[PDB]
Amino acid sequence: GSSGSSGTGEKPYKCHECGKVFRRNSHLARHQLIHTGEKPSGPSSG
Ligand SMILES: [Zn+2]
């Protein structure tokens, strides 16, 4: 229950797959592609 914030602060995401840290979340999203590849949204035949 520790208190005390450093203003706006920050919360950089860290890839648990390899251990690479990223500034924002989006940066990590594209990185995840190297690990997982699930692109359901976007039919080809249909
Ligand atoms: Zn990674």
From Swiss-Prot:
**Residues in C2H2-type zinc fingers:** 13-35
Localization per Swiss-Prot or TrEMBL = Nucleus
Functional description taken from the UniProt entry: May be involved in transcriptional regulation.
Similarity remark: Belongs to the krueppel C2H2-type zinc-finger protein family.
Name recorded for this polypeptide: Zinc finger protein 347
* Classification of source organism: Eukaryota, Metazoa, Chordata, Craniata, Vertebrata
